[PDB]
Amino acid sequence: AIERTLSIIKPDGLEKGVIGKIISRFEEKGLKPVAIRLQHLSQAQAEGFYAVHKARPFFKDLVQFMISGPVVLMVLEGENAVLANRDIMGATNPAQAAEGTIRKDFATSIDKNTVHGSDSLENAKIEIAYFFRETEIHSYPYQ
Amino acid sequence: AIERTLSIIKPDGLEKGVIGKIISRFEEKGLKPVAIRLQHLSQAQAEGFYAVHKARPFFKDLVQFMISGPVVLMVLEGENAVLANRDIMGATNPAQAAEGTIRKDFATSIDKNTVHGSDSLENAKIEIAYFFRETEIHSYPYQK
Amino acid sequence: AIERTLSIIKPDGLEKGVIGKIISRFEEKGLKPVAIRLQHLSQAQAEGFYAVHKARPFFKDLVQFMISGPVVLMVLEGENAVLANRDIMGATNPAQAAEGTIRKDFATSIDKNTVHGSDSLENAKIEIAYFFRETEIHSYPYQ
Amino acid sequence: AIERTLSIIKPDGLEKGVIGKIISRFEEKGLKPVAIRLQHLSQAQAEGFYAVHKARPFFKDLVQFMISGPVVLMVLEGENAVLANRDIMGATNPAQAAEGTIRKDFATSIDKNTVHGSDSLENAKIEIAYFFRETEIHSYPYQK
Ligand SMILES: Nc1ncnc2c1ncn2[C@@H]1O[C@@H]2COP(=O)(O)O[C@H]2[C@H]1O
Ligand SMILES: Nc1ncnc2c1ncn2[C@@H]1O[C@@H]2COP(=O)(O)O[C@H]2[C@H]1O
Ligand SMILES: Nc1ncnc2c1ncn2[C@@H]1O[C@@H]2COP(=O)(O)O[C@H]2[C@H]1O
Ligand SMILES: Nc1ncnc2c1ncn2[C@@H]1O[C@@H]2COP(=O)(O)O[C@H]2[C@H]1O
């Protein structure tokens, strides 16, 4: 089914100058960007967004990196988007990422892994509403 | 010096699924996207943005096309960005556009010419302020 | 229970210069404004927001009035907010509105009735997400 | 002539539950709110907004207070709005504030002085552009 999922190009992705290349990976696989906004997250925004990891030992580092510079927030729409997105991104740890994935091609380490994608449809709903009004999301037909 | 200019990927750009290709054209040339927002313009927003051409015969059609679908608004930053942006975009009329430019590679007609870029530094300041708060624009370093 | 509901000060409310008076009505009754944004709705936004009335005969007029000028969008937080808000607003038709209500005091007619409030908690969730990101809503304590 | 100026209702204003009272002070004086947005400022936003006072000894405390809770950002429009706004707000130090002004009626101390208003027209232009796109500002007529 057609689903909507959240994608975030992390600070390292912008610094590497590959925003366009990452978006093209999605577009060519049928994941249509229907919302996009470059933003610099505050500490409160990063902490609230990653609440599910608050008990994890990497939480503090994740938050500091996520606010180290601006990120590109996006909503991708497409067939089985939640899973398709994660496949395209590749393993969380670049070392284990498959060839041709965003993380294998551009990520430096597990901490600076270039992208985030919602892990489930339930989480996607929450993550999207966290950063986008419904009025900021616009589908359009492909020609 | 380092300047900022406005770039808009028109509805036809999104419909052809080439948002990434266009952004890459800028990144590879050293024009850094420091603000990006996909938005669906209202008639009032388009008319206000293109007010200078209100006395033009194509104005009405321009507005209808500009509100026919969503667009991607962007602020590009770099050395002589206003001019560099115009070089990368190519001639307003795709037919007259040079090889390798965005309009020559992606545009279909003068009306559906894929992108808009501020024509001068004075206009850039106005176009940027029209669509972005200064707090929505963020520079960052380029590093691998 | 503490709930969040959507409130909209319609074009006529701004034209009458009573934005502050309306907000004070809420504040003094314990309905805390936790999100506020002045905005000029486009036709598509008004139509999508009032989708539930698309089959009604007043739909077209409602949409035209709602885009006639800017409005103030707000999220109110408080005890039994959905119902409390509607009580404070008063009857949809100013003619039947109770004394002391926003509509009795400021509304001109059923068409230009100054305010909108979500009619239910289910609708509140939808209306709020339509106009606000979760990151645009901020609770604060009263002192 | 008709000007636009920035007004910020500081954290203490929201905590006392007087957002409406303050906005009414402006409306009753003919200062029309043409842009309004409740927002929680980040440290970077506050520091950037108050950069001129970075060499001041109270700067650090100013920033902490300005990010301690959400604020209401507004653009006011009217004849000689910049000056009219300053009259309504009253002296920066509530103690020195005249009767009937916002600071005399609501402020607690110089640090917790309830509102900020642009001090000049030049600054207003900068402060407004910092927090609002031109497309987020909308004038309307006053009529019953
Ligand atoms: N060992 C770890 N397991 C999972 N994620 C980790 C770990 N260490 C760091 N992280 C990071 O924490 C992030 C949380 O979600 P992301 O999808 O953004 O990607 C994750 C990784 O970048
Ligand atoms: N005769 C024309 N000359 C210039 N602009 C035109 C003409 N016909 C249509 N247009 C469009 O009007 C637009 C005005 O600004 P753009 O930079 O968006 O690009 C222009 C063209 O796409
Ligand atoms: N007879 C009607 N019944 C209900 N709402 C009406 C009617 N005619 C016009 N309306 C308007 O339609 C609006 C829809 O929801 P509101 O709460 O915004 O308030 C309603 C009234 O302003
Ligand atoms: N000694 C001081 N002189 C001026 N501003 C001060 C002083 N101490 C604290 N401040 C605060 O610093 C703020 C700077 O701009 P505001 O208009 O927000 O109002 C000012 C006061 O609230």
JSON list of C-alpha atoms in Angstrom, two decimals, chain B residues 16-138:
[
{"chain": "B", "resi": 16, "resn": "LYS", "atom": "CA", "xyz": [9.41, 14.82, -13.79]},
{"chain": "B", "resi": 17, "resn": "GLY", "atom": "CA", "xyz": [10.88, 13.52, -10.53]},
{"chain": "B", "resi": 18, "resn": "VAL", "atom": "CA", "xyz": [14.15, 15.42, -10.88]},
{"chain": "B", "resi": 19, "resn": "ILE", "atom": "CA", "xyz": [14.34, 17.40, -7.60]},
{"chain": "B", "resi": 20, "resn": "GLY", "atom": "CA", "xyz": [17.57, 15.60, -6.65]},
{"chain": "B", "resi": 21, "resn": "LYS", "atom": "CA", "xyz": [19.22, 16.06, -10.06]},
{"chain": "B", "resi": 22, "resn": "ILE", "atom": "CA", "xyz": [18.57, 19.80, -9.95]},
{"chain": "B", "resi": 23, "resn": "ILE", "atom": "CA", "xyz": [19.84, 20.23, -6.38]},
{"chain": "B", "resi": 24, "resn": "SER", "atom": "CA", "xyz": [22.95, 18.22, -7.37]},
{"chain": "B", "resi": 25, "resn": "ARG", "atom": "CA", "xyz": [23.60, 20.67, -10.25]},
{"chain": "B", "resi": 26, "resn": "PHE", "atom": "CA", "xyz": [23.92, 23.40, -7.61]},
{"chain": "B", "resi": 27, "resn": "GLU", "atom": "CA", "xyz": [25.90, 21.43, -5.06]},
{"chain": "B", "resi": 28, "resn": "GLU", "atom": "CA", "xyz": [28.46, 20.31, -7.64]},
{"chain": "B", "resi": 29, "resn": "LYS", "atom": "CA", "xyz": [28.98, 23.95, -8.64]},
{"chain": "B", "resi": 30, "resn": "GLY", "atom": "CA", "xyz": [29.58, 25.14, -5.10]},
{"chain": "B", "resi": 31, "resn": "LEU", "atom": "CA", "xyz": [26.13, 26.69, -4.66]},
{"chain": "B", "resi": 32, "resn": "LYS", "atom": "CA", "xyz": [25.11, 25.53, -1.19]},
{"chain": "B", "resi": 33, "resn": "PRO", "atom": "CA", "xyz": [21.40, 25.08, -0.40]},
{"chain": "B", "resi": 34, "resn": "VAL", "atom": "CA", "xyz": [21.06, 26.88, 2.96]},
{"chain": "B", "resi": 35, "resn": "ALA", "atom": "CA", "xyz": [17.24, 26.92, 3.06]},
{"chain": "B", "resi": 36, "resn": "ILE", "atom": "CA", "xyz": [14.78, 24.49, 1.44]},
{"chain": "B", "resi": 37, "resn": "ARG", "atom": "CA", "xyz": [10.99, 24.20, 1.72]},
{"chain": "B", "resi": 38, "resn": "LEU", "atom": "CA", "xyz": [8.47, 22.39, -0.44]},
{"chain": "B", "resi": 39, "resn": "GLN", "atom": "CA", "xyz": [5.29, 24.46, -0.55]},
{"chain": "B", "resi": 40, "resn": "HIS", "atom": "CA", "xyz": [2.13, 24.79, -2.59]},
{"chain": "B", "resi": 41, "resn": "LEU", "atom": "CA", "xyz": [1.76, 28.46, -3.48]},
{"chain": "B", "resi": 42, "resn": "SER", "atom": "CA", "xyz": [-1.60, 30.20, -3.26]},
{"chain": "B", "resi": 43, "resn": "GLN", "atom": "CA", "xyz": [-2.73, 32.55, -6.03]},
{"chain": "B", "resi": 44, "resn": "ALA", "atom": "CA", "xyz": [-2.01, 35.58, -3.82]},
{"chain": "B", "resi": 45, "resn": "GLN", "atom": "CA", "xyz": [1.53, 34.38, -3.06]},
{"chain": "B", "resi": 46, "resn": "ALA", "atom": "CA", "xyz": [2.36, 33.81, -6.75]},
{"chain": "B", "resi": 47, "resn": "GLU", "atom": "CA", "xyz": [0.86, 37.14, -7.84]},
{"chain": "B", "resi": 48, "resn": "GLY", "atom": "CA", "xyz": [2.74, 38.98, -5.12]},
{"chain": "B", "resi": 49, "resn": "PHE", "atom": "CA", "xyz": [6.00, 37.26, -6.00]},
{"chain": "B", "resi": 50, "resn": "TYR", "atom": "CA", "xyz": [5.70, 38.00, -9.73]},
{"chain": "B", "resi": 51, "resn": "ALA", "atom": "CA", "xyz": [4.18, 41.49, -9.35]},
{"chain": "B", "resi": 52, "resn": "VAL", "atom": "CA", "xyz": [6.79, 43.06, -11.67]},
{"chain": "B", "resi": 53, "resn": "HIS", "atom": "CA", "xyz": [5.27, 41.13, -14.61]},
{"chain": "B", "resi": 54, "resn": "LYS", "atom": "CA", "xyz": [1.67, 42.02, -13.83]},
{"chain": "B", "resi": 55, "resn": "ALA", "atom": "CA", "xyz": [1.59, 44.30, -16.89]},
{"chain": "B", "resi": 56, "resn": "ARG", "atom": "CA", "xyz": [2.86, 41.40, -19.03]},
{"chain": "B", "resi": 57, "resn": "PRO", "atom": "CA", "xyz": [0.58, 39.37, -21.27]},
{"chain": "B", "resi": 58, "resn": "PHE", "atom": "CA", "xyz": [1.77, 36.03, -19.88]},
{"chain": "B", "resi": 59, "resn": "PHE", "atom": "CA", "xyz": [1.29, 36.97, -16.20]},
{"chain": "B", "resi": 60, "resn": "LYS", "atom": "CA", "xyz": [-2.07, 35.27, -15.88]},
{"chain": "B", "resi": 61, "resn": "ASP", "atom": "CA", "xyz": [-0.77, 31.99, -17.27]},
{"chain": "B", "resi": 62, "resn": "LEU", "atom": "CA", "xyz": [2.40, 32.27, -15.18]},
{"chain": "B", "resi": 63, "resn": "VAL", "atom": "CA", "xyz": [0.34, 32.42, -11.99]},
{"chain": "B", "resi": 64, "resn": "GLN", "atom": "CA", "xyz": [-1.90, 29.49, -12.94]},
{"chain": "B", "resi": 65, "resn": "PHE", "atom": "CA", "xyz": [1.10, 27.31, -13.70]},
{"chain": "B", "resi": 66, "resn": "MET", "atom": "CA", "xyz": [2.87, 28.42, -10.51]},
{"chain": "B", "resi": 67, "resn": "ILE", "atom": "CA", "xyz": [-0.10, 27.30, -8.39]},
{"chain": "B", "resi": 68, "resn": "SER", "atom": "CA", "xyz": [-0.89, 24.18, -10.42]},
{"chain": "B", "resi": 69, "resn": "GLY", "atom": "CA", "xyz": [1.25, 22.01, -8.18]},
{"chain": "B", "resi": 70, "resn": "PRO", "atom": "CA", "xyz": [3.77, 22.28, -5.34]},
{"chain": "B", "resi": 71, "resn": "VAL", "atom": "CA", "xyz": [7.22, 23.85, -5.81]},
{"chain": "B", "resi": 72, "resn": "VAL", "atom": "CA", "xyz": [10.53, 23.57, -3.91]},
{"chain": "B", "resi": 73, "resn": "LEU", "atom": "CA", "xyz": [11.73, 26.95, -2.58]},
{"chain": "B", "resi": 74, "resn": "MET", "atom": "CA", "xyz": [15.48, 27.25, -1.90]},
{"chain": "B", "resi": 75, "resn": "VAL", "atom": "CA", "xyz": [18.14, 29.77, -0.90]},
{"chain": "B", "resi": 76, "resn": "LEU", "atom": "CA", "xyz": [21.56, 29.11, -2.48]},
{"chain": "B", "resi": 77, "resn": "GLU", "atom": "CA", "xyz": [24.78, 30.49, -0.97]},
{"chain": "B", "resi": 78, "resn": "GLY", "atom": "CA", "xyz": [28.19, 30.93, -2.55]},
{"chain": "B", "resi": 79, "resn": "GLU", "atom": "CA", "xyz": [30.71, 33.18, -4.24]},
{"chain": "B", "resi": 80, "resn": "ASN", "atom": "CA", "xyz": [28.86, 35.31, -6.82]},
{"chain": "B", "resi": 81, "resn": "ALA", "atom": "CA", "xyz": [25.82, 33.07, -6.27]},
{"chain": "B", "resi": 82, "resn": "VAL", "atom": "CA", "xyz": [23.32, 35.28, -8.12]},
{"chain": "B", "resi": 83, "resn": "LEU", "atom": "CA", "xyz": [25.29, 35.11, -11.35]},
{"chain": "B", "resi": 84, "resn": "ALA", "atom": "CA", "xyz": [26.47, 31.52, -10.91]},
{"chain": "B", "resi": 85, "resn": "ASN", "atom": "CA", "xyz": [22.82, 30.50, -10.42]},
{"chain": "B", "resi": 86, "resn": "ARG", "atom": "CA", "xyz": [21.80, 32.18, -13.71]},
{"chain": "B", "resi": 87, "resn": "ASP", "atom": "CA", "xyz": [24.65, 30.40, -15.55]},
{"chain": "B", "resi": 88, "resn": "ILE", "atom": "CA", "xyz": [23.57, 26.98, -14.24]},
{"chain": "B", "resi": 89, "resn": "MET", "atom": "CA", "xyz": [19.90, 27.60, -15.04]},
{"chain": "B", "resi": 90, "resn": "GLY", "atom": "CA", "xyz": [20.59, 28.77, -18.57]},
{"chain": "B", "resi": 91, "resn": "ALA", "atom": "CA", "xyz": [18.43, 31.02, -20.76]},
{"chain": "B", "resi": 92, "resn": "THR", "atom": "CA", "xyz": [14.83, 31.61, -19.68]},
{"chain": "B", "resi": 93, "resn": "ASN", "atom": "CA", "xyz": [13.76, 30.19, -23.07]},
{"chain": "B", "resi": 94, "resn": "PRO", "atom": "CA", "xyz": [14.95, 26.54, -23.03]},
{"chain": "B", "resi": 95, "resn": "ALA", "atom": "CA", "xyz": [15.42, 26.74, -26.79]},
{"chain": "B", "resi": 96, "resn": "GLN", "atom": "CA", "xyz": [18.08, 29.39, -26.31]},
{"chain": "B", "resi": 97, "resn": "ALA", "atom": "CA", "xyz": [19.62, 27.62, -23.29]},
{"chain": "B", "resi": 98, "resn": "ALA", "atom": "CA", "xyz": [23.24, 26.48, -23.42]},
{"chain": "B", "resi": 99, "resn": "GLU", "atom": "CA", "xyz": [24.30, 22.86, -23.21]},
{"chain": "B", "resi": 100, "resn": "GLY", "atom": "CA", "xyz": [24.52, 21.37, -19.75]},
{"chain": "B", "resi": 101, "resn": "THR", "atom": "CA", "xyz": [22.23, 23.97, -18.17]},
{"chain": "B", "resi": 102, "resn": "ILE", "atom": "CA", "xyz": [19.15, 22.97, -16.17]},
{"chain": "B", "resi": 103, "resn": "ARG", "atom": "CA", "xyz": [16.73, 24.42, -18.70]},
{"chain": "B", "resi": 104, "resn": "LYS", "atom": "CA", "xyz": [18.40, 22.76, -21.68]},
{"chain": "B", "resi": 105, "resn": "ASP", "atom": "CA", "xyz": [18.38, 19.38, -19.92]},
{"chain": "B", "resi": 106, "resn": "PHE", "atom": "CA", "xyz": [14.99, 19.49, -18.19]},
{"chain": "B", "resi": 107, "resn": "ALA", "atom": "CA", "xyz": [12.73, 22.31, -19.42]},
{"chain": "B", "resi": 108, "resn": "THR", "atom": "CA", "xyz": [9.99, 21.81, -22.00]},
{"chain": "B", "resi": 109, "resn": "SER", "atom": "CA", "xyz": [8.95, 25.36, -22.93]},
{"chain": "B", "resi": 110, "resn": "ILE", "atom": "CA", "xyz": [9.41, 28.97, -21.86]},
{"chain": "B", "resi": 111, "resn": "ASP", "atom": "CA", "xyz": [6.34, 28.67, -19.65]},
{"chain": "B", "resi": 112, "resn": "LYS", "atom": "CA", "xyz": [7.33, 25.30, -18.24]},
{"chain": "B", "resi": 113, "resn": "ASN", "atom": "CA", "xyz": [11.01, 26.13, -17.72]},
{"chain": "B", "resi": 114, "resn": "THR", "atom": "CA", "xyz": [11.62, 24.10, -14.53]},
{"chain": "B", "resi": 115, "resn": "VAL", "atom": "CA", "xyz": [13.36, 26.75, -12.38]},
{"chain": "B", "resi": 116, "resn": "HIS", "atom": "CA", "xyz": [13.37, 30.37, -11.36]},
{"chain": "B", "resi": 117, "resn": "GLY", "atom": "CA", "xyz": [16.43, 32.15, -9.98]},
{"chain": "B", "resi": 118, "resn": "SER", "atom": "CA", "xyz": [16.69, 35.77, -8.77]},
{"chain": "B", "resi": 119, "resn": "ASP", "atom": "CA", "xyz": [17.92, 38.01, -11.62]},
{"chain": "B", "resi": 120, "resn": "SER", "atom": "CA", "xyz": [20.00, 40.40, -9.50]},
{"chain": "B", "resi": 121, "resn": "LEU", "atom": "CA", "xyz": [21.31, 40.85, -6.00]},
{"chain": "B", "resi": 122, "resn": "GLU", "atom": "CA", "xyz": [18.71, 43.53, -5.21]},
{"chain": "B", "resi": 123, "resn": "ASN", "atom": "CA", "xyz": [15.92, 41.19, -6.23]},
{"chain": "B", "resi": 124, "resn": "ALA", "atom": "CA", "xyz": [17.47, 38.24, -4.37]},
{"chain": "B", "resi": 125, "resn": "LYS", "atom": "CA", "xyz": [17.15, 40.14, -1.08]},
{"chain": "B", "resi": 126, "resn": "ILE", "atom": "CA", "xyz": [13.49, 40.77, -1.74]},
{"chain": "B", "resi": 127, "resn": "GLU", "atom": "CA", "xyz": [12.69, 37.24, -3.04]},
{"chain": "B", "resi": 128, "resn": "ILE", "atom": "CA", "xyz": [14.43, 35.56, -0.10]},
{"chain": "B", "resi": 129, "resn": "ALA", "atom": "CA", "xyz": [12.66, 37.74, 2.51]},
{"chain": "B", "resi": 130, "resn": "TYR", "atom": "CA", "xyz": [9.36, 36.98, 0.78]},
{"chain": "B", "resi": 131, "resn": "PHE", "atom": "CA", "xyz": [9.63, 33.23, 1.41]},
{"chain": "B", "resi": 132, "resn": "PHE", "atom": "CA", "xyz": [12.04, 32.82, 4.33]},
{"chain": "B", "resi": 133, "resn": "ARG", "atom": "CA", "xyz": [12.63, 34.17, 7.84]},
{"chain": "B", "resi": 134, "resn": "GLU", "atom": "CA", "xyz": [16.35, 34.72, 8.51]},
{"chain": "B", "resi": 135, "resn": "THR", "atom": "CA", "xyz": [15.94, 31.96, 11.14]},
{"chain": "B", "resi": 136, "resn": "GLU", "atom": "CA", "xyz": [14.98, 29.51, 8.37]},
{"chain": "B", "resi": 137, "resn": "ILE", "atom": "CA", "xyz": [18.33, 29.96, 6.59]},
{"chain": "B", "resi": 138, "resn": "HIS", "atom": "CA", "xyz": [21.33, 28.03, 7.87]}
]
